[PDB]
Design a protein around this ligand. Sequence first.
Ligand code: CA
Ligand code: CA
Lengths: 322, 322
Amino acid sequence: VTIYDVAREASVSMATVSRVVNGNPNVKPSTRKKVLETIERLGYRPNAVTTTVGVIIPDISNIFYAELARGIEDIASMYKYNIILSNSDQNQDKQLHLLNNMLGKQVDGIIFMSGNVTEEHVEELKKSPVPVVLAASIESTNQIPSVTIDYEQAAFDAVQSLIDSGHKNIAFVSGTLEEPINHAKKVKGYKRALTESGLPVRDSYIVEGDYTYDSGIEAVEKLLEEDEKPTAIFVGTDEMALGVIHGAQDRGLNVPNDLEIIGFDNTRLSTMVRPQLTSVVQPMYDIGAVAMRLLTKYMNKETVDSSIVELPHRIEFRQSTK
Amino acid sequence: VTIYDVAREASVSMATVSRVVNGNPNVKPSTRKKVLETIERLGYRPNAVTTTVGVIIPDISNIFYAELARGIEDIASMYKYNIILSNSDQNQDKQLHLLNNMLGKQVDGIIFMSGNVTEEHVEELKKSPVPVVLAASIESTNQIPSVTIDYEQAAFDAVQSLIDSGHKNIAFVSGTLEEPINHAKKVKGYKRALTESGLPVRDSYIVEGDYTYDSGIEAVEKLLEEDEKPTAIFVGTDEMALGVIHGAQDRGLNVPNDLEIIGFDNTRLSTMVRPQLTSVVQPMYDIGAVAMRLLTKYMNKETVDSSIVELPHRIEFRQSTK
Ligand SMILES: [Ca+2]
Ligand SMILES: [Ca+2]
């Protein structure tokens, strides 16, 4: 809290705040009153008389960003570090500004979270003086410290449970393939699970959605038009999965009996469909906590050993698998 | 764009910006460079050389707030008025500040939108010098200009289609009853539709949810425990309706065949369940447009005649009714 903070708050100039502070007798009584109340309310002391991290995540409101922020928050409380958090609505030329907004507010470190981490973001993360560590976000470049689950393995495990259940024809509905989470991790996890059981990797069992429910609807439809129809489908995110489920249901198919579906992220939506969606669970609270610790390690100039941290994931088996 | 705007943007004082503007020769070249670029980028002219409205709505992102903002926006473009829009996440002691943030940025008028309009908000809306008009929001007090649908009638019409379909035992799952939209409008609409067909108004057919999906689940469950089970249910919002649908489905009941359900607001969610949700549609784009016109009328000191404007609603009949 400084003169500047009082001025903004009292809709007045720094020089006026100083004037009031100095007991200048020609300040309009009302403005003097206004700024003294501001001075008191903010706790501004007129006598010259710590470590914070900036956090950027898509939105405050989303439940799975919310246990990440708590994980971040709880480490901050213990460590006596303050949090500056900003809800971004993750977009390219608006998460970048919210990044440099942290740098211009004297943060000692940055925790960053975005679904699509651009190559452009990395070139500005390296120039950033303070250390930064990604939470539940991956850049295939692997220069920037990251703490996440093992997306490839989680993909593998999801498709594995389909395989273990007797399915030979198993499809994958992806978010945009250009993103590493998809082409570098989930696609490959899905592929590996197939090849390891001597199953066929068909290009036409990999359909690309756009993360919307509808693209999910379109994806099952396209899959159901295939010669040998898939009898199970892994879906890269929950929102698409509901679309996958409902399009199947619209085509007269039963989930799980005619078609088994598995999702990802264990969002609120996974329990807002019938059958409820089997979905890969990330430990968002832990990812936040560990991110905060990893960030601290760098900030404290400590030898990290391993900059890419991978936490266990699990699968909440619900009714969309049998 | 003023000296102040350049200063904030160039992370520098007004006096420094003036110094650079005046060609003061002892300003550090780099800071002179920094502020000249800021001056150019913002379009600041150093020579002394219109009507805007503030808009407060829960969030930018939500599709049904998004055709309201477009309706607002399109009237603004025509009228050559600029929009200052703020996403609130509608809460009591945070929508109030975002209201006075408009007043402190010299807006000529305010369009306000919130699910729960508090009595406290009205006492601060009257003191506000510039005129304000509520969009898709109601204060039972009816002092403050409002443009909305006819909630009572829309409720009536929803329950009417159940009645017309042969249902005698019809329940209502409400959002919190304390809010006028519910107790003063939808409850009464629901009641009227019953009494007008000589049907019974049972206290136990009115259950109170909290706008969550889950409270919806709990509400059907409680309804299904009744002696004479309702065979149709009106639900005050879509989110609760999905909960209502799924709890019925979980109890082995078919929607629409064992239980007909109707929702409200025609949110994205209404088409993200099976059966798709029959739901009252508001014309959000029109409510925004008309709100903007009504606001203009007041701002132009024009004789309004009728401060409470009610627009037609309709019902998107989907599969949750037969
Ligand atoms: Ca087709
Ligand atoms: Ca019970």
